[PDB]
Amino acid sequence: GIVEQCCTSICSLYQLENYCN
Amino acid sequence: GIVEQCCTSICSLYQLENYCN
Amino acid sequence: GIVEQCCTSICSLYQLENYCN
Amino acid sequence: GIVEQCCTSICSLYQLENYCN
Amino acid sequence: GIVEQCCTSICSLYQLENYCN
Amino acid sequence: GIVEQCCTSICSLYQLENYCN
Amino acid sequence: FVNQHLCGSHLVEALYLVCGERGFFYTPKA
Amino acid sequence: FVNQHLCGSHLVEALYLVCGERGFFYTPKA
Amino acid sequence: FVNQHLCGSHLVEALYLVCGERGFFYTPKA
Amino acid sequence: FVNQHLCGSHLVEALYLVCGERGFFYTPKA
Amino acid sequence: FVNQHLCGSHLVEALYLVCGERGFFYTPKA
Amino acid sequence: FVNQHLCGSHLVEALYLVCGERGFFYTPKA
Ligand SMILES: [Zn+2]
Ligand SMILES: [Zn+2]
């Protein structure tokens, strides 16, 4: 998931928006 | 400037991009 | 909620555990 | 010590309490 | 102490060095 | 540069002062 | 442990420290 | 916006920045 | 994205997140 | 509470959270 | 260097930066 | 003052601490 991806790879602020409420 | 926009007032991530080199 | 308990008022690390999944 | 342990291994919030005043 | 010097008032990095072991 | 040096090697607060305005 | 005023991003760092691997929700509307 | 390498508490700070008062869930695998 | 009150070091972390590899200037006199 | 991997300034933030107004000593070996 | 208002966890990050390997004490009662 | 190992957002926090209201430029190579 996101936690794993942003750390072991790279991620974007737009991917992070998927986790807002 | 930035303090007035983002600290006294409120600012978006898009406004913050104005300060990227 | 959390802001009212932990920011306006004061809260313990034990209260913070209420917000763990 | 604690600094070394928490970083090279792992430590708990209860171990950290040993360093409060 | 430190809070009074560095948080109510204002303090320099040199004053902060007074609290190094 | 500074970003590279402080991370891949080591740097001092006095080197960082070179980047103030 | 002690009682803290914890606000904004500080509150979320505290939740990360306390919850870690369990994960957490931050819901200031609730 | 640029790609991000975000580990640990740095990822939670980014979520806070992105989501704000909307809130967010922090849910690590395992 | 949401509108945030961002102050002091929090404002600079936000600029780092948003700008990254491009770099940024922080000029509170301006 | 869960186990923590805490390096650098992250360990000092955790001490601040745990100890609060009680204060704390940060004393690395070497 | 400049004079800063430094509070709460920000004060402890500043002490970590300034003191590093020497270590420090944070004693807000004193 | 002591030597610093500063990566990522930790370097920007140090710049903020050192420069304050003077401001600063954060300019990574590449
Ligand atoms: Zn703060
Ligand atoms: Zn870090």
From Swiss-Prot, chains A, B, C, D, E, F:
Disulfide bonds join 6-11. This is Insulin A chain. It comes from the Eukaryota. The chain holds residues 88 to 108 of 108 of the full protein.
Swiss-Prot record, chains G, H, I, J, K, L:
This is Insulin B chain. The gene is INS. It comes from the Eukaryota.
